[PDB]
Amino acid sequence: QVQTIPMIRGARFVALFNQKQPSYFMNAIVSLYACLNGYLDDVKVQYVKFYEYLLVHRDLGIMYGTAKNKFFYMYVQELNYLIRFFTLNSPILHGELEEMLKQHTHLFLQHYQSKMNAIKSEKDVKALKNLLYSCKRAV
Amino acid sequence: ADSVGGQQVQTIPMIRGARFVALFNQKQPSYFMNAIVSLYACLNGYLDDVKVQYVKFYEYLLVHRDLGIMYGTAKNKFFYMYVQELNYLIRFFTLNSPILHGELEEMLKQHTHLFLQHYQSKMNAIKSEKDVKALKNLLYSCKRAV
Amino acid sequence: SGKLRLYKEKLEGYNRFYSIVKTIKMVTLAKYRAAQGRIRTRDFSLRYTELAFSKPQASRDAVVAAKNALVYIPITTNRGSCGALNSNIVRCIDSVVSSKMVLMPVGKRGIDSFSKLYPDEFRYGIINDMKESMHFGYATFVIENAYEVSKDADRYQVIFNRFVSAGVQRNAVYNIPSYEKWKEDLADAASSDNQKNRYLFANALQNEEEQLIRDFFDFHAALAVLNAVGENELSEQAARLVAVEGQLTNISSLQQRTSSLYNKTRQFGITAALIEILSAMSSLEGNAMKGVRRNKFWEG
Amino acid sequence: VDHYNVAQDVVQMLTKYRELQDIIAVLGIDELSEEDKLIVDRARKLVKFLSQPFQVAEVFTGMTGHYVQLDDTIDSFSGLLMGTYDQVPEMAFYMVGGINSVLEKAKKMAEEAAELEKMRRAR
Numbered sequence: 017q018v019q020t021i022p023m024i025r026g027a028r029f030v031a032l033f034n035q036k037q038p039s040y041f042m043n044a045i046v047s048l049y050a051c052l053n054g055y056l057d058d059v060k061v062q063y064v065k066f067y068e069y070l071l072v073h074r075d076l077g078i079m080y081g082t083a084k085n086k087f088f089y090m091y092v093q094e095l096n097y098l099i100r101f102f103t104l105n106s107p108i109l110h111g112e113l114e115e116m117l118k119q120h121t122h123l124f125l126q127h128y129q130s131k132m133n134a135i136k137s138e139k140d141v142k143a144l145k146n147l148l149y150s151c152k153r154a155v
Numbered sequence: 156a157d158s159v160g161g162q163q164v165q166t167i168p169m170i171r172g173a174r175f176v177a178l179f180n181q182k183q184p185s186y187f188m189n190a191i192v193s194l195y196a197c198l199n200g201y202l203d204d205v206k207v208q209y210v211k212f213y214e215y216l217l218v219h220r221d222l223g224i225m226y227g228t229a230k231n232k233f234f235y236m237y238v239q240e241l242n243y244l245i246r247f248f249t250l251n252s253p254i255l256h257g258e259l260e261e262m263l264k265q266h267t268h269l270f271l272q273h274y275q276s277k278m279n280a281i282k283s284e285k286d287v288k289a290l291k292n293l294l295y296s297c298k299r300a301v
Numbered sequence: 302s303g304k305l306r307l308y309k310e311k312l313e314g315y316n317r318f319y320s321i322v323k324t325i326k327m328v329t330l331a332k333y334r335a336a337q338g339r340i341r342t343r344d345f346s347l348r349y350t351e352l353a354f355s356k357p358q359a360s361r362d363a364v365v366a367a368k369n370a371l372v373y374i375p376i377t378t379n380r381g382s383c384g385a386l387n388s389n390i391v392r393c394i395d396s397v398v399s400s401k402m403v404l405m406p407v408g409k410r411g412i413d414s415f416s417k418l419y420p421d422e423f424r425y426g427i428i429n430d431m432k433e434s435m436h437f438g439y440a441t442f443v444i445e446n447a448y449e450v451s452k453d454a455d456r457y458q459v460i461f462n463r464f465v466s467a468g469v470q471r472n473a474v475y476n477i478p479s480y481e482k483w484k485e486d487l488a489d490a491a492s493s494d495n496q497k498n499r500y501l502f503a504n505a506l507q508n509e510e511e512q513l514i515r516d517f518f519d520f521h522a523a524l525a526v527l528n529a530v531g532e533n534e535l536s537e538q539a540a541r542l543v544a545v546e547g548q549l550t551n552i553s554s555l556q557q558r559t560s561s562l563y564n565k566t567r568q569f570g571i572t573a574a575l576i577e578i579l580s581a582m583s584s585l586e587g588n589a590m591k592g593v594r595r596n597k598f599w600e601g
Numbered sequence: 602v603d604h605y606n607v608a609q610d611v612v613q614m615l616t617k618y619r620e621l622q623d624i625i626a627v628l629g630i631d632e633l634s635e636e637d638k639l640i641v642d643r644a645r646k647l648v649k650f651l652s653q654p655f656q657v658a659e660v661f662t663g664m665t666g667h668y669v670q671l672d673d674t675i676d677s678f679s680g681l682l683m684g685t686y687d688q689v690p691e692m693a694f695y696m697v698g699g700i701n702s703v704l705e706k707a708k709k710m711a712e713e714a715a716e717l718e719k720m721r722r723a724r
């Protein structure tokens with residue numbers, strides 16, 4: 017099974033398309049940009065939904081104190097119209113967008129995926145499945 | 156279903172299915188006693204050693220003839236295929252009953268032994284231009300005789 | 302209606318096709334289930350054969366300097382439906398075509414493919430009925446014919462299929478240099494530091510008599526042929542099972558596409574016939590006209 | 602949510618059991634991986650556990666009927682999927698209601714087996 021770059025991103029895109037409720041414009045576009053730029057290459061397919069949830073409804077950098085962005089924090093819903101206005105590739109919002117994405121990817125791979133890859137107990141497996149079910153149904 | 160090529164293997168279920176599917180060929184309706192007896196014989200394996208082509212002839216001898224009486228070997232007291240009034244006894248008492256089960260098996264065993272010993276042995280030894288035709292005509296006649 | 306039954310006949314044919322193909326799967330699975338044993342008992346007969354013939358040489362110097370017949374013995378299956386094995390082998394042979402190429406293919410498909418493709422180069426082919434197990438005698442028959450085809454041959458090559466796993470069937474090559482070139486290399490591996498791994502093996506053969514060496518050469522050549530045909534059979538049955546499954550699914554998709562057109566046709570046929578009748582009913586009703594009513598209208 | 606997760610897990614296991622069933626046809630169960638031989642054991646227990654004896658047939662079949670509660674069914678299947686009841690024999694799930702019935706049937710089967718073995722040793 018040869019997995020080139022297009023194949024990896026396509027699979028991640030398909031997983032992201034799984035939705036139950038309509039998504040806010042800022043959350044959806046940000047997640048699409050992250051996947052398009054390869055930030056989810058290291059993230060396993062089954063963990064994409066959990067990765068997306070942490071990006072929208074959580075903030076890892078603030079949690080672990082490694083964030084320095086001035087404005088581009090995803091809890092700021094007001095940024096949606098700023099993104100709609102300029103673009104996600106504008107120099108105004110491009111640098112901070114990359115920085116927060118890199119920090120979020122680095123923290124997720126370091127803390128969450130590493131632990132999820134080291135689960136063998138049947139009880140823990142059941143807990144992980146329940147967690148994935150909840151995340152898939154909620155962003 | 157696997158017999159379309161592959162040289163279908165003759166297990167006991169197949170060895171008995173073929174006889175069943177060959178006993179179902181008939182022209183005139185069969186008296187209940189004759190039909191039930193023939194099915195029972197094929198069900199318990201008395202026709203396993205009988206070739207599929209000779210089944211109808213075997214059934215005809217069982218019904219319209221009595222090999223045991225012919226060779227003076229029959230030992231049953233009442234259970235004979237020429238007693239057409241046993242039909243209602245069989246209807247009241249199933250063939251799998253001690254009243255009739257013992258004699259039924261004895262008659263079937265004796266008839267099967269005599270048939271293999273005398274008739275089928277000669278059939279497998281037919282080598283001629285007229286005997287083969289006579290055998291073929293006989294089998295066809297027995298096909299539509301019972 | 303004939304049109305509706307045309308689909309029904311078409312779908313009737315596809316049904317029998319599925320049954321027959323499924324019967325093919327049953328046959329191959331039995332042969333594969335009994336041919337799976339070699340997987341356990343292989344990879345040990347050809348140990349000193351490696352030393353005799355294993356020479357990772359370049360692919361150009363070997364064929365460029367051919368002054369004598371280069372004989373090829375591709376392994377091909379008698380029956381089709383195997384897959385791309387025969388096609389790839391032909392591609393592997395087409396890639397090595399030369400002036401001195403002689404072909405002695407194995408199997409009807411190889412003969413049929415190469416008799417048309419390479420009539421002049423093709424001399425004749427060997428055919429084995431897949432009734433007994435692939436034995437030494439068959440390999441000895443391949444070699445004897447190969448020598449008689451071209452005794453003064455620079456090399457004899459065998460191109461077969463190696464069954465790596467149930468879903469992996471690669472193409473493998475056994476190149477067998479004739480006696481003169483082999484004994485010359487065996488003489489250099491003995492004297493010289495070059496070919497260290499073969500130094501002890503070569504000197505242990507030069508000590509013995511020549512006839513023994515010739516017998517040794519033929520014997521190991523036969524073993525290589527025996528391995529190739531044995532593997533090519535196992536790859537064949539494994540490939541046929543994969544291919545037959547593909548045919549089953551293709552014949553199932555057609556059964557689901559011709560059934561829809563048959564159930565769509567019956568619905569349209571019922572609707573149209575009924576519409577025709579009602580149109581005639583309405584025409585005969587419209588042409589009818591009510592006459593003057595001859596009743597006591599005043600009496601009311 | 603627990604009901605939905607259990608139901609989807611059961612469906613997934615049954616679907617996998619079908620593909621594994623076809624794989625063994627070409628291979629044999631001994632070839633399958635030990636994950637796919639624990640999954641072919643749990644699935645068979647599930648198939649047997651979805652049967653049930655109905656009280657309407659208490660007369661013509663002779664077996665006391667069962668009326669399994671919703672919560673009891675969810676818990677029983679959830680435990681089975683995890684692997685808690687991996688020691689119970691397969692037949693203990695056949696024509697039973699709930700998890701307690703499974704335990705009772707298993708004990709009766711164990712007692713019957715012990716008595717038969719004890720009788721055999723005597724002779």
Ligand SMILES: O=c1ccn([C@@H]2O[C@H](COP(=O)(O)OP(=O)(O)OP(=O)(O)O)[C@@H](O)[C@H]2O)c(=O)[nH]1
Pocket residue numbers: 508509510
């Ligand atoms: O006139 C001769 C001389 C030698 N030879 C053959 O050359 C080889 C030399 O063989 P070796 O010198 O290596 O050993 P050896 O005498 O112990 O051999 P064995 O009898 O144990 O096999 C042996 O195989 C011998 O038969 C002949 O056949 N004829």
